[PDB]
Design a protein around this ligand. Structure first.
Ligand code: 3PH
Ligand code: PIO
Ligand code: 9Z9
Ligand code: 9Z9
Lengths: 325, 149
């Protein structure tokens, strides 16, 4: 503790300054690992012993500790809290899969009630986290808690699932709509496992690299979108010239050109052999347009995107390593 | 069952030929590179498994809302989404054209999920895997050459 500097250790001063090169030093990492290990003395092979201890309380006594009171010492380490939370989340995910896979009855099953309890208590904990924030302004605590993206997506998912639950406890059609809302919602909870993955040394950097390659890829999404839209409009306006205006036109533009570049290159679905059906005027340009579009979208743009990912990997790798540390 | 165990054995004995192959100068290093590249690949296999499971659960729970609890459910989650990203993207088996069948509630979301799932699994993760294999090749090659010698 530093008396002159208002009871702040060097680590807190370094963190407040956003000094990445200081925290990422070897000594700071060793100190953080020692603090994370708590009061235990398992170094060579940990984690599995933590799982064995949390599953079997008698296994706690056969551990080496640092200088009755052993159980409270073990259970309050950060690592065992993390593993307890991870096991709880795995159980919640299993129950959320089970409730949506099988048929849903009029009133919720007990597993569904467990899922509702999990969501409600997690919302309560988030509310507690908001309420006990450091700044003294009740409006600035919300804006200082909405600084990450995970705690924003959690709020959105909690609100959406609450809306779906309220819609569920109704008659049959609104119950089906609530089921569809649950089906959409489960995707986010499955994706959220990357936050749990982020503890592992070799997975966090990969997640950060993915997060940056998303914005690296967002442009070659747009260019391929333009090419695909052009081809789709051309094929739709060549093959079918006698269609009344309907919203089905907006589906044929994006459907077939998108499914064509992913292996469903069908010469019978498009370019029909027109006993034999009558041939449309100017319909012999569809194979040529398709050939050019496939050549551009599968040999040029994807290879250029591969090159872009390849040549900017060292910088992103180093930055992600520093940020995770 | 005897011949099935024989099939498992012949799988292993066919794989065992690489130890004989590791005599030639240009084949031992490639095998010892394959081992470390598999060690690298396992992580992206895990991530793709998570994404695949998410899409499979969403599809199964959207399209069929009146199924019974059976072990066939654990197959439909993994089977079709895994075979989809390997060149079988048949848009007829997925999203049936709901004379015409009555549409399921929210049966239009499935192609919207499919677009994002294919975009992630064929344009992002595999390209990042290629980049990982590319930027960590020289040191692996040198170490493999030394260990073979
Ligand atoms: C908003 C939730 C609505 C739920 C209903 C719809 C859900 C379907 C879409 C899923 C959207 C989930 C949002 C998760 C994105 C937040 C990432 C983040 O927090 O950044 C932290 C982190 C950085 O924040 P920093 O502290 O500012 O640096 O960046 C990442 O780690 C990126 C991790 C996400 C990348 C992989 C996941 C993308 C998969 C989406 C593909 C859709 C699958 C469909 C099958
Ligand atoms: C779904 C998982 C999401 C949570 C992810 C959980 C985070 C995660 O993936 O790692 C935790 C644990 C291994 O990590 P853990 O910290 O326990 O132990 C590390 C490991 O022994 C390394 O080999 C050590 O050296 P290095 O690093 O090689 O140099 C390292 O010491 P250090 O030399 O570094 O000081 C040790 O810290 O693995 C499991 O999940 C076991 C349960 C199996 C899974 C059980 C379920 C199948
Ligand atoms: C053919 O007739 C069968 C019948 C017995 C039926 O028993 C059922 C018991 C529930 C059970 C085991 C069954 C089918 C889906 C099973 C789900 C698959 C899910 O997968 C997992 C997959 C991976 C997890 C990550 C997510 O959930 C489970 C939560 C989930 C899971 C294992 C819950 C358990 C379900 C079978 C015969 O007896 C008379
Ligand atoms: C089933 O019967 C339908 C009928 C109502 C029909 O209303 C029509 C109004 C015009 C509208 C919305 C319709 C079909 C093609 C639609 C085009 C698709 C084009 O796509 C876009 C695609 C993307 C844009 C970038 C380019 O253009 C539009 C210029 C274009 C677009 C959105 C213009 C709008 C057109 C439906 C029901 O009423 C009784």
């Amino acid at each position: 503790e530093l008396k002159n500097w208002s009871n702040a250790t060097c680590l807190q001063l370094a963190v407040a300054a956003k000094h990445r090169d200081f925290i990422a030093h070897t000594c700071s990492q060793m100190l953080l690992t020692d603090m994370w290990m708590g009061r235990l003395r398992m170094r060579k092979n940990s984690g599995l012993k933590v799982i064995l201890g949390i599953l079997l309380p008698p296994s706690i006594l056969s551990l080496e500790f640092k200088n009755g009171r052993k159980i409270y010492e073990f259970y309050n380490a950060p690592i065992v809290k993390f593993w307890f939370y991870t096991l709880a989340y795995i159980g919640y995910l299993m129950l959320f899969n089970y409730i949506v896979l099988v048929k849903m009855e009029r009133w919720p099953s007990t597993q569904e009630w467990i899922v509702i309890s999990y969501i409600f208590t997690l919302g309560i904990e988030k509310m507690r986290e908001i309420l006990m924030s450091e700044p003294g302004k009740l409006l600035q605590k919300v804006k200082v808690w909405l600084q990450e993206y995970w705690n924003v997506t959690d709020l959105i998912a909690i609100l959406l699932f609450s809306v779906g639950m309220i819609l569920r406890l109704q008659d049959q059609p609104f119950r089906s709509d609530g089921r569809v809302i649950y089906c959409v919602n489960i995707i986010y909870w499955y994706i959220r496992l990357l936050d749990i993955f982020g503890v592992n040394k070799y997975l966090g950097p990969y997640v950060m690299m993915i997060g940056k390659m998303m914005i690296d890829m967002m442009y070659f999404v747009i260019i391929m979108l333009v090419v695909l839209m052009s081809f789709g409009v051309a094929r739709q306006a060549i093959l079918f010239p006698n269609e009344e205006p309907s919203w089905k036109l907006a589906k044929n533009i994006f459907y077939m050109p998108y499914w064509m570049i992913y292996g469903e290159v069908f010469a019978d679905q498009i370019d029909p052999p027109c006993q034999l059906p009558p041939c449309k005027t100017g319909a012999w340009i569809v194979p040529a347009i398709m050939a050019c579009y496939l050549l551009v979208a599968n040999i040029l743009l994807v290879n250029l995107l591969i090159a872009v990912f390849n040549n900017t990997f060292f910088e992103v790798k180093s930055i992600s390593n520093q940020v995770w540390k």
